[PDB]
């Protein structure tokens, strides 16, 4: 299984977050609706090298399920391959990748610096299956792992957040925070 370990790296890489999508810092958890815009901010302390790329991948949070590949349920599976949970919208250079050994899916875009008038780079992710989809995530928590990689694919930085894809993000966040 791919590592989830936070690695700020040489460029001081971290994530930020701004109901269709809501983030709980206390839980390090995003709650979002299926197919809706999920803004994830990339923050760096120094400019990454030319051709730096940003990869997103989902894994199960629980150790006992970590070897299982996160993919869309049969119903939802039937630019993006239909099996992929995570898509990117609003980007002309999206790559959908299937690992030849692990079969794990990921979605990659080029790293771009913040637009003029901004301090961070935003990527709009879409999650295409609900956490509750049986025959898929089966209510089991997932993590999204965001990796900053150089042009050769080498690790520059890593961060992660838990995700629940659900009908009522605000309500579920409140419940999970009360728990
Ligand atoms: Zn589904």
């Amino acid at each position: 299984v791919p590592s989830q370990k936070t690695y700020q790296g040489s460029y001081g890489f971290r994530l930020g977050f701004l109901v269709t999508c809501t983030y709980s810092p206390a839980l390090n958890k995003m709650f979002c609706q299926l197919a809706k815009t999920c803004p994830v901010q990339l923050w760096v302390d120094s400019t990454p090298p030319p051709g730096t790329r940003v990869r997103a991948m989902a894994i199960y949070k629980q150790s006992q399920h970590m070897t299982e590949v996160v993919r869309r349920c049969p119903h939802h599976e039937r630019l993006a391959p239909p099996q992929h949970l995570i898509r990117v919208e609003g980007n002309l250079r999206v790559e959908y990748l299937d690992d030849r050994n692990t079969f794990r899916h990921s979605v990659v875009v080029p790293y771009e610096p913040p637009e003029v008038g901004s301090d961070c780079t935003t990527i709009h992710y879409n999650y295409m299956c609900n956490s509750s989809c049986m025959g898929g995530m089966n209510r089991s928590p997932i993590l999204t792992i965001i990796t900053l990689e150089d042009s050769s694919g080498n690790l520059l930085g890593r961060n992660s957040f838990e995700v629940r894809v659900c009908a009522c993000p605000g309500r579920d966040r409140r419940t999970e925070e009360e728990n």
Side-chain angles (χ1 to χ4, degrees), residues 1-4 6-7 9-18 20-35 37-77 79-99 101-114 116-138 140-173 175-177 179:
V1 78
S3 181
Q4 72 175 263
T6 298
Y7 181 58
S10 298
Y11 304 98
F13 175 57
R14 70 276 182 203
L15 298 179
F17 307 87
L18 277 291
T20 51
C21 185
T22 185
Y23 173 79
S24 171
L27 296 169
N28 184 212
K29 185 166 183 168
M30 171 183 293
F31 297 79
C32 60
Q33 289 179 329
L34 197 160
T37 305
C38 299
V40 174
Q41 302 173 341
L42 317 177
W43 295 77
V44 294
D45 291 335
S46 55
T47 315
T52 292
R53 291 149 63 79
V54 187
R55 184 189 303 266
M57 177 188 288
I59 65 164
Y60 288 107
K61 181 182 174 181
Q62 296 165 86
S63 181
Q64 67 188 220
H65 304 309
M66 273 194 182
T67 65
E68 300 295 334
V69 173
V70 179
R71 60 185 290 172
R72 295 185 81 185
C73 72
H75 171 88
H76 281 122
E77 181 186 327
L79 303 174
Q83 307 84 1
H84 282 227
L85 174 70
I86 309 178
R87 296 184 189 172
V88 171
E89 67 169 312
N91 193 293
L92 299 177
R93 288 294 179 261
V94 185
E95 294 172 38
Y96 290 94
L97 301 175
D98 283 66
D99 194 282
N101 284 111
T102 73
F103 297 91
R104 289 182 192 273
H105 305 152
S106 61
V107 58
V108 175
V109 293
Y111 173 82
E112 289 178 281
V116 173
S118 179
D119 297 330
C120 65
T121 301
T122 299
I123 298 168
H124 288 165
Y125 291 108
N126 298 335
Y127 294 83
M128 303 305 302
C129 214
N130 258 33
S131 291
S132 71
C133 282
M134 295 311 193
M137 289 179 283
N138 290 0
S140 195
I142 61 160
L143 306 180
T144 299
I145 296 163
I146 307 296
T147 311
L148 199 65
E149 299 172 11
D150 73 13
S151 63
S152 293
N154 294 297
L155 176 69
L156 301 178
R158 193 191 287 113
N159 284 287
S160 63
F161 55 97
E162 186 172 343
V163 184
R164 176 175 170 95
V165 189
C166 56
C168 317
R171 193 275 310 290
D172 286 354
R173 176 183 172 185
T175 304
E176 293 197 22
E177 285 179 342
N179 292 355

